[PDB]
């Protein structure tokens, strides 16, 4: 309002304190953006880490599992997401969860569905086959559990085909 | 817990505020000579002073369109809780939701509402599992040449032996004909194993 | 239009305690609420009117 | 140029306090840490990771544990490494019934402004030189009053479900 | 009521409420959940 | 006179700012609530919806 005149500044009282009103309505925006992201990627309160053995019963999760090669331990899912994505008196302020711990969530997210199926979401997490929790649910959606189970083959490559096909989704 | 019943509290606190700022610019002159009315009305020339009072017009004024669109933004959010709460007084407390942390951390058994000033409680009642033991598992079990699968359940392993249970509390009992369903051959199936199923 | 404080509203007694050098009342939006007579010594709330 | 906020671990605990300047150098102001979010003075840094109590920015928290006050990188939680196998199933054998609390606002203050006594108070002459504004009035008011209605169905699409009062 | 602003009082008292509450809670431990359908 | 005039004109774009800030954090927030439900049910979960 005033820049670096002094003449204004005593001057910008006489006309009112919004400068005061509307600095707390920014703040309360501001911390709301550090709630609502712990809304969604602070659910969980243990870092499941993924296995060293990444064999799932023929399930590959290469393209959403962190990848240790590269840096800030993204997935190549993450990774193209990334890609394809101080002034005169207004500051940017930075976010309290960086990129690093948002993909580390997501990464015990990710790692606590493959080894514990939905247990971690409602209590420990209880360790289970991946083909044993496929099963389960498959006969949640109305479909007995010897349907995978005789068809796993088939599922894990149509599973396997289906994440190949995201990032093309996504980038073309 | 200081913190437990804060979000009634920032409401409130949020109304005060709100109104303590809208009575606090009344003080405010806006540019003009002074604030009080009456003053401007009794020093200055009555056929000359419109221009001035015009401008004590428009600070009240644009100040109370700003304190009625906070008011609706403020009244769009709470009418959002507002059906959030009554979706959860529907799905919770008037039933059992099997949506997974809608009712509380685990699974959901049943909910309480409680009254509170310009709110609602709810105590969500719900189920977690502890003490957990680990077990060798088999998708499936081969008796009589033909693979079997638990109707409803998982196969466990006692160390040397077998038994079917449900997968949300350990029940052992003993794999028969009743507790598993037969379907194809045993060379189909990935991970099964021998065990004889009671007749 | 208590020595010099002008204002507008219903005068009632009040049971509140000033000291002795104090002789108006204020309360948190910064607005006369209570008035000390100035003859007597007695306190009067002041409240809008209707 | 940057905003100055005072860390504070509560008057009830101790005195102490530290200054962040956020955005800002440390070698520009006039025991520091050169914070991603700032210049952070009256805090040492730890590499002991904890849960994140003050926030900061950029992943720094302050804390306040032993007479002083510590800046650390937020810790996300326990490091659980779930015992995978192709054959190892985890079934509970016991359980705990538990009772979470969940508050949630449902109205507010029904709240209604008089506007020539606002902007004018019992004034003849500013009364009459709001109409030269319009009838700005009225849309307070209508805007006021659709407000205050709304909040009155807040509560009746909340509490009032039951057709019949239960005893 | 002090300056032109009015607070209007709810249409349903803190003790209504209070009413609707023990209906639920009375509808939902003697009968579950039958009573909302 | 002029640097009221122009103190006023400043003001109000900064409030219109303000405002326009809030309509986008409550959009963003209804959104972000919606992710929230979608992490508990579709991820943390299966959903019948
Ligand atoms: C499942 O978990 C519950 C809760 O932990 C277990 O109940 C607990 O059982 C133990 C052993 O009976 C109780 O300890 C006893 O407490 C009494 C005092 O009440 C004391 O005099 C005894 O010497 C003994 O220490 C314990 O109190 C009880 N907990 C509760 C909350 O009632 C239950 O046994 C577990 N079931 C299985 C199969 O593991
Ligand atoms: C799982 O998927 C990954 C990636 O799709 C596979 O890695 C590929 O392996 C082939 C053959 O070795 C290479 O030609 C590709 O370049 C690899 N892709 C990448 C992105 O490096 C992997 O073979 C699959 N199977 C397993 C068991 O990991
Ligand atoms: C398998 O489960 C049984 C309980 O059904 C455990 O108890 C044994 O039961 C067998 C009967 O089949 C008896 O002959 C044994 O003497 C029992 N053991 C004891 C210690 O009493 C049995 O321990 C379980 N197997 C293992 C390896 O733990
Ligand atoms: C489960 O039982 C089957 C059949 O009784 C076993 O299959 C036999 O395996 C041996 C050794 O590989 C062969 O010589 C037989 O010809 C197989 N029988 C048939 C009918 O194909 C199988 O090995 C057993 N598995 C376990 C883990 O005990
Ligand atoms: C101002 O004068 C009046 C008039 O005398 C005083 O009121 C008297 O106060 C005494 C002591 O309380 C009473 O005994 C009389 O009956 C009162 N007279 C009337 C007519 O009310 C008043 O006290 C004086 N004010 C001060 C500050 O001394
Ligand atoms: C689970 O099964 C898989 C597949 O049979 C095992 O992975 C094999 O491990 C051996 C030994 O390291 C390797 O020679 C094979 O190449 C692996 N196969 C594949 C497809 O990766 C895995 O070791 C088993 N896990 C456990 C705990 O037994
Ligand atoms: C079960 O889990 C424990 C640790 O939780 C582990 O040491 C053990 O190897 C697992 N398997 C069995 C059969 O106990
Ligand atoms: C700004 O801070 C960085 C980080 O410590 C430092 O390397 C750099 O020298 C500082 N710049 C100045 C002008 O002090």
């Given at each position: 309002?005033?820049?670096?005149?002094?003449?204004?500044?005593?001057?910008?009282?006489?006309?009112?304190?919004?400068?005061?009103?509307?600095?707390?309505?920014?703040?309360?925006?501001?911390?709301?953006?550090?709630?609502?992201?712990?809304?969604?990627?602070?659910?969980?309160?243990?870092?499941?880490?993924?296995?060293?053995?990444?064999?799932?019963?023929?399930?590959?999760?290469?393209?959403?599992?962190?990848?240790?090669?590269?840096?800030?331990?993204?997935?190549?899912?993450?990774?193209?997401?990334?890609?394809?994505?101080?002034?005169?008196?207004?500051?940017?302020?930075?976010?309290?969860?960086?990129?690093?711990?948002?993909?580390?969530?997501?990464?015990?997210?990710?790692?606590?569905?493959?080894?514990?199926?939905?247990?971690?979401?409602?209590?420990?997490?209880?360790?289970?086959?991946?083909?044993?929790?496929?099963?389960?649910?498959?006969?949640?959606?109305?479909?007995?559990?010897?349907?995978?189970?005789?068809?796993?083959?088939?599922?894990?490559?149509?599973?396997?085909?289906?994440?190949?096909?995201?990032?093309?989704?996504?980038?073309? | 817990?200081?913190?437990?019943?804060?979000?009634?509290?920032?409401?409130?606190?949020?109304?005060?505020?709100?109104?303590?700022?809208?009575?606090?610019?009344?003080?405010?002159?806006?540019?003009?000579?002074?604030?009080?009315?009456?003053?401007?009305?009794?020093?200055?020339?009555?056929?000359?002073?419109?221009?001035?009072?015009?401008?004590?017009?428009?600070?009240?004024?644009?100040?109370?369109?700003?304190?009625?669109?906070?008011?609706?933004?403020?009244?769009?959010?709470?009418?959002?809780?507002?059906?959030?709460?009554?979706?959860?007084?529907?799905?919770?407390?008037?039933?059992?939701?099997?949506?997974?942390?809608?009712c509380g951390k685990g699974?959901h058994?049943?909910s309480?509402?409680?009254?509170?000033?310009?709110?609602?409680?709810f105590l969500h009642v719900t189920?977690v599992?502890?003490?957990?033991?680990?077990?060798?598992?088999?998708?499936?079990?081969?008796?009589?040449?033909?693979?079997?699968?638990?109707?409803?359940?998982?196969?466990?392993?006692?160390?040397?032996?077998?038994?079917?249970?449900?997968?949300?509390?350990?029940?052992?009992?003993?794999?028969?004909?009743?507790?598993?369903?037969?379907?194809?051959?045993?060379?189909?199936?990935?991970?099964?194993?021998?065990?004889?199923?009671?007749? | 239009?208590?020595?010099?404080?002008?204002?507008?509203?219903?005068?009632?007694?009040?049971?509140?305690?000033?000291?002795?050098?104090?002789?108006?009342?204020?309360?948190?939006?910064?607005?006369?609420?209570?008035?000390?007579?100035?003859?007597?010594?007695?306190?009067?709330?002041?409240?809008?009117?209707? | 140029?940057?905003?100055?906020?005072?860390?504070?671990?509560?008057?009830?605990?101790?005195?102490?306090?530290?200054?962040?300047?956020?955005?800002?150098?440390?070698?520009?102001?006039?025991?520091?840490?050169?914070?991603?979010?700032?210049?952070?003075?009256?805090?040492?840094?730890?590499?002991?990771?904890?849960?994140?109590?003050?926030?900061?920015?950029?992943?720094?928290?302050?804390?306040?544990?032993?007479?002083?006050?510590?800046?650390?990188?937020?810790?996300?939680?326990?490091?659980?490494?779930?015992?995978?196998?192709?054959?190892?199933?985890?079934?509970?054998?016991?359980?705990?019934?538990s009772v979470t609390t969940e508050?949630?606002?449902?109205?507010?203050?029904?709240?209604?402004?008089?506007?020539?006594?606002?902007?004018?108070?019992?004034?003849?002459?500013?009364?009459?030189?709001?109409?030269?504004?319009?009838?700005?009035?009225?849309?307070?008011?209508?805007?006021?009053?659709?407000?205050?209605?709304?909040?009155?169905?807040?509560?009746?699409?909340?509490?009032?479900?039951?057709?019949?009062?239960?005893?």
């Open positions: 309002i005033c820049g670096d005149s002094t003449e204004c500044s005593n001057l910008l009282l006489q006309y009112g304190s919004f400068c005061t009103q509307l600095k707390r309505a920014l703040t309360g925006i501001a911390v709301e953006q550090d709630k609502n992201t712990q809304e969604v990627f602070a659910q969980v309160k243990q870092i499941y880490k993924t296995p060293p053995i990444k064999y799932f019963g023929g399930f590959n999760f290469s393209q959403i599992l962190p990848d240790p090669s590269k840096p800030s331990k993204r997935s190549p899912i993450e990774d193209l997401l990334f890609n394809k994505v101080k002034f005169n008196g207004l500051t940017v302020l930075p976010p309290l969860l960086t990129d690093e711990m948002i993909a580390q969530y997501t990464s015990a997210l990710l790692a606590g569905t493959i080894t514990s199926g939905w247990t971690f979401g409602a209590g420990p997490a209880l360790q289970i086959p991946f083909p044993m929790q496929m099963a389960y649910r498959f006969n949640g959606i109305g479909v007995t559990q010897n349907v995978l189970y005789e068809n796993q083959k088939l599922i894990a490559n149509q599973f396997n085909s289906a994440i190949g096909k995201i990032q093309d989704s996504l980038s073309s | 817990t200081p913190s437990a019943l804060g979000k009634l509290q920032d409401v409130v606190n949020h109304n005060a505020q709100a109104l303590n700022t809208l009575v606090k610019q009344l003080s405010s002159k806006f540019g003009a000579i002074s604030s009080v009315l009456n003053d401007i009305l009794s020093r200055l020339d009555p056929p000359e002073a419109e221009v001035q009072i015009d401008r004590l017009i428009t600070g009240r004024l644009q100040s109370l369109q700003t304190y009625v669109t906070q008011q609706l933004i403020r009244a769009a959010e709470i009418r959002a809780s507002a059906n959030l709460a009554a979706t959860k007084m529907s799905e919770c407390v008037l039933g059992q939701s099997k949506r997974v942390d809608f699974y058994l049943m309480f509402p409680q009254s509170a000033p310009h709110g609602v409680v189920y599992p502890a003490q957990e033991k680990n077990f060798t598992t088999a998708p499936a079990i081969c008796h009589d040449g033909k693979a079997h699968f638990p109707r409803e359940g998982v196969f466990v392993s006692n160390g040397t032996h077998w038994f079917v249970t449900q997968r949300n509390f350990y029940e052992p009992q003993i794999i028969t004909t009743d507790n598993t369903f037969v379907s194809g051959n045993c060379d189909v199936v990935i991970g099964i194993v021998n065990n004889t199923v009671y007749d | 239009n208590f020595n010099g404080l002008t204002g507008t509203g219903v005068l009632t007694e009040s049971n509140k305690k000033f000291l002795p050098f104090q002789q108006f009342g204020r309360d948190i939006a910064d607005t006369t609420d209570a008035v000390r007579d100035p003859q007597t010594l007695e306190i009067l709330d002041i409240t809008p009117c209707s | 140029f940057g905003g100055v906020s005072v860390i504070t671990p509560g008057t009830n605990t101790s005195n102490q306090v530290a200054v962040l300047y956020q955005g800002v150098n440390c070698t520009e102001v006039p025991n520091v840490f050169q914070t991603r979010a700032g210049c952070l003075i009256g805090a040492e840094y730890v590499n002991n990771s904890y849960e994140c109590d003050i926030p900061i920015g950029a992943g720094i928290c302050a804390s306040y544990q032993t007479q002083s006050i510590i800046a650390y990188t937020m810790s996300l939680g326990a490091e659980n490494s779930v015992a995978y196998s192709n054959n190892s199933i985890a079934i509970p054998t016991n359980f705990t019934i508050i949630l606002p449902v109205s507010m203050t029904k709240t209604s402004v008089d506007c020539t006594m606002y902007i004018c108070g019992d004034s003849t002459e500013c009364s009459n030189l709001l109409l030269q504004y319009g009838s700005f009035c009225t849309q307070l008011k209508r805007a006021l009053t659709g407000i205050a209605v709304e909040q009155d169905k807040n509560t009746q699409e909340v509490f009032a479900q039951v057709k019949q009062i239960y005893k």
